[model samples]
Target chain A: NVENVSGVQGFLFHTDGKESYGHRAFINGVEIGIKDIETVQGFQQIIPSINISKSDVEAIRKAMK
Target chain B: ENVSGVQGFLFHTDGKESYGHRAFINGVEIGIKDIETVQGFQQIIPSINISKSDVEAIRKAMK
Candidate 1:
């Protein structure tokens, strides 16, 4: 379970003709790649993925405000 | 007259609630609305009722 907050954000999806990259860049200029995920406890890992850098995650966290 | 090579771009609506505004431009950069919810998705259309020549003009403007 995760807490919800209010904020302005944007999502960008890029496909390099072969691979798909999904990133969530908030209004405060924070961006993270989907492959950087570390662990999933309560969440279901239906698909295999990677973990993003902590700094990028922190950027998104602060942007929520 | 036979019009050729016409196209349209889809834009989502945004802003205050209640009354709304929609504008179709020919070749100038214009402020557009943002997509909000499912209802907003229903409001966006890739094609408008304008003439083919007008669409071509708009495309040229975007470029």
Candidate 2:
């Protein structure tokens, strides 16, 4: 875990079903679940709009189930 | 291009709430109970392998 996070790729996160974030996304390598609003707000604060879509949300919700 | 606002760390309050008041910075998980200042963050930052600049950025972002 002692790697350089000097880039966007360094900030690794995902909504993999094996995890337990429910409708939320695990972000930046933590167990924290970012709500849809928080996800856009947080990322937008640093980068461009991610524009998370409903289809993406549906897929993740399905996977988590 | 590198996403250059803040790097080398990530932070958020414990969404589970199962652990009570808590926060995670980078990969260093810790309790935040009443810790509402930069020093609170600084105290736990050393636990992880992060850079001075990254630390500064984290501080600024929090503020």
Candidate 3:
């Protein structure tokens, strides 16, 4: 049996479906849907879709520097 | 000479001086300082430093 420790990951593109440009980042799975974008930093930047360890997410947020 | 057109530009905070939690806007040698608060930096300003035309230009450039 395989362990489902890791989940799926994704991201939203602000320039419509154009992924070549715009800012992107990982998001909280519980707070995101299949294909949607969430606002951040007073900008319409989309949330990233990906399933990572809870610890990983915390680290990313801390490393925002 | 004074130009009727307004220009806008973006700059990452120098992150050096303790300018408070506000944003600064400059036009031609004339600069408006301490306009808005930098949420993370906790700096606050009393009035808007950037002009409306400048803001619109920024939004367009961001698009």
Candidate 4:
């Protein structure tokens, strides 16, 4: 059950040197890949995900330009 | 319209009846853990740590 969910790319991480993923964060008692998790508290927060927001996507494009 | 038009209460969001608002829904086998005894085997038994809050939440989503 544990360490069986890996490589699907939702939120991925490792346990006991094994990889795992989840349909959502924190499911099946694993913290897959919140790798560079950071936030500005009141302004922003960042973790890892296959889900993204329209606002953030727009912001990223604007910065690149 | 899928909430009442097609699928019978198959969703929720932010703990309310947000039926048919997305491409995902869960709750196939209930989490009603060990409140009753049907005298069945381990796999067949009704087991989980479900409570009234869980039932109430489920009712809101599926009722």
Candidate 5:
């Protein structure tokens, strides 16, 4: 259903105030670790656990535009 | 205004569709066109009174 995305969408944030390793994002119900979030290939590797379709993965990339 | 309570902003949406280049602040969505442009970051820096360094940190996370 995320067919209308034209720019950066989804959730991104970091934790402060305590022992913070890094940031995290939630996209299409997938929890993404921030360590590998800088590139698409890096991001793609994390989605297999969620069973995301290839088209949906591309949609997520487009949404980051 | 701070939903996370751990400090800093929390971006999320309840809708099934992607929010489209936007993040929530003060319970409202603001366009974040990558936070590299004036239009992208002006909405948050001024409204939320966040420091420029924090903006840079956010930029790093976004990249």
Candidate 6:
């Protein structure tokens, strides 16, 4: 499970047979979900779930360095 | 997204009330007997419909 989320992506959340897209997406690789308001910090504004992939993880790791 | 209702999403949260109401942090899982604090509204979700096959499907998809 991922904590201290530092990345994000966009995806559809199915609600009552209806898929929602307007919702801002967010995830840390482990606990992924939406709903909440933020400013910048995780406690506030998330990085905005931006779409992740095995290839992207490698890129993030490299960027961190 | 945790609770597996018989149909779609039915959360059996505090007060056991029903309505399109739910309050929680994204991705954070809360159980039937769980308590939590969320931003905005100090809300309570509708009663949950915990089902094995339903949650199992969620797990399967996540996996």
Each candidate structure's TM-score, on Cα atoms with residue i matched to residue i, is: 0.25, 0.29, 0.18, 0.19, 0.25, 0.21
The sequence of per-residue lDDT tens digits that candidate 2 reaches over residues B1-63 is 323322333345323323333334443435555546534544433213222223233333331
Per lDDT, the best of the predicted structures is: 5
Scanning candidate 3 chain A in windows of ten residues, the lowest lDDT window is A46-55
Candidate 2 docking quality: incorrect, acceptable, medium or high: incorrect
Q: For model 5, what is the alpha-carbon lDDT of residue B61? A: 61
TM-score, predicted candidate 5 vs. hidden true structure: 0.25
TM-score of 6: 0.21
Question: Which residues of candidate 6, in runs, are more than 4 Å off?
Answer: A1-65, B1-24, B34-50, B60-63
Docking outcome class, model 6: incorrect
Docking class of 3: incorrect
Docking class of 4: incorrect
Give the Cα-based TM-score of candidate 2 against the true structure.
0.29
Q: Compose the digit string of candidate 2's lDDT tens values, residues A1-65.
A: 34334222212134444444333332332223333443434444333333334446555444444
lDDT digits (tens) for residues A6-64 of candidate 4? 11112322233233321223222332222222211100111233443433444533443
> Candidate 1 residues B1-63, lDDT tens each?
101111223333243332232233222223233223112212322423344335456546564
lDDT of each: 0.29, 0.36, 0.28, 0.24, 0.37, 0.29
TM-score of chain A of each: 0.27, 0.25, 0.24, 0.19, 0.40, 0.26
Q: Which predicted model would earn the best DockQ?
A: 2
The list of candidate 4 runs beyond 4 A from truth reads: A1-65, B1-37
Winning model by TM-score? 2
Model 2 spans > 4 angstroms off: A1-34, A51-65, B1-21, B36-63
Clashing pairs for predicted structure model 2, backbone only: none
- Could you tell me the lDDT of residue B36 within candidate 6? 36
Error of 2 at B29 (Å): 2.1
